[PDB]
């Protein structure tokens, strides 16, 4: 009787994480858990790479909600979701996630003395720490 | 009263994933969940990158068990674990994980017609699918 297995996914631009400043963000509407990956471009393949990670983390969802951006509605992405057996529909929860994540990234970056872009070699750990801070005790 | 929050972590070499063929593997001894990342070299920083991901995924553990490899016992890694407040001790569960993971990678690769090394552009999704298959329904 628990919540349905439905995600919302979006991309959000975060220059503190450049050059891979396109953050793909999934929120599990059941648990509120967030998965975020970084990408150098917003493409169908980026979305697919991100969901492959999100499935590794969260399991296989029944459905994913996105907007009607071309990277979500392309033949390529429609086929990839069909290959996984995931229903796709074309979002307040992921909008809130985007804000919580960008705020957390800024606080953690500034805490480490990075007032502008985060040095490339430090980004992966700082993004993972933001994800940890949003999801876990 | 649930299981203690203790991980085991190891590196295992998987040439099907070359050039980033060093797989860092954590198993949560509580749940049996596995986190795996790929690395081009086995270094203290690789271990730290891997645990940063594993914390994002699983939460912050109370302790991590490893062997006495230099990448785990270096000043750098001892300090990184202290920064996180994670107790470190210097492993059957992660050995089993290593085997389950390499077997799963081979089956999935061969299923996609890759009988030797997996093409670089396909590795990230295939590793994530192996992780998914081990952890989730």
UniProtKB/TrEMBL annotation, chains A, B:
Identify the residues that the record assigns to the Integrase catalytic domain, covering every copy: 1-137
Question: According to the record, which residues of the full protein are present here?
Answer: 627 to 771 of 895
Name it. Pol protein
Domain of life, per the record?
A: Viruses
């Amino acid at each position: 009787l628990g919540p349905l297995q439905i995600w919302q996914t979006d991309f959000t631009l975060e220059p503190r994480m450049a050059p891979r400043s396109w953050l793909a963000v999934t929120v599990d509407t059941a648990s509120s858990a967030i998965v975020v990956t970084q990408h150098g471009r917003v493409t169908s393949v980026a979305a697919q790479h991100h969901w492959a990670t999100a499935i590794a983390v969260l399991g296989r969802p029944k459905a994913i909600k996105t907007d009607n951006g071309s990277c979500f509605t392309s033949k390529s992405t429609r086929e990839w979701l069909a290959r996984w057996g995931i229903a796709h529909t074309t979002q307040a929860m992921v909008e809130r996630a985007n804000r919580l994540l960008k705020d957390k990234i800024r606080v953690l970056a500034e805490g480490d003395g990075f007032m502008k872009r985060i040095p490339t070699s430090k980004q992966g750990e700082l993004l993972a720490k933001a994800m940890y801070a949003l999801n876990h005790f």
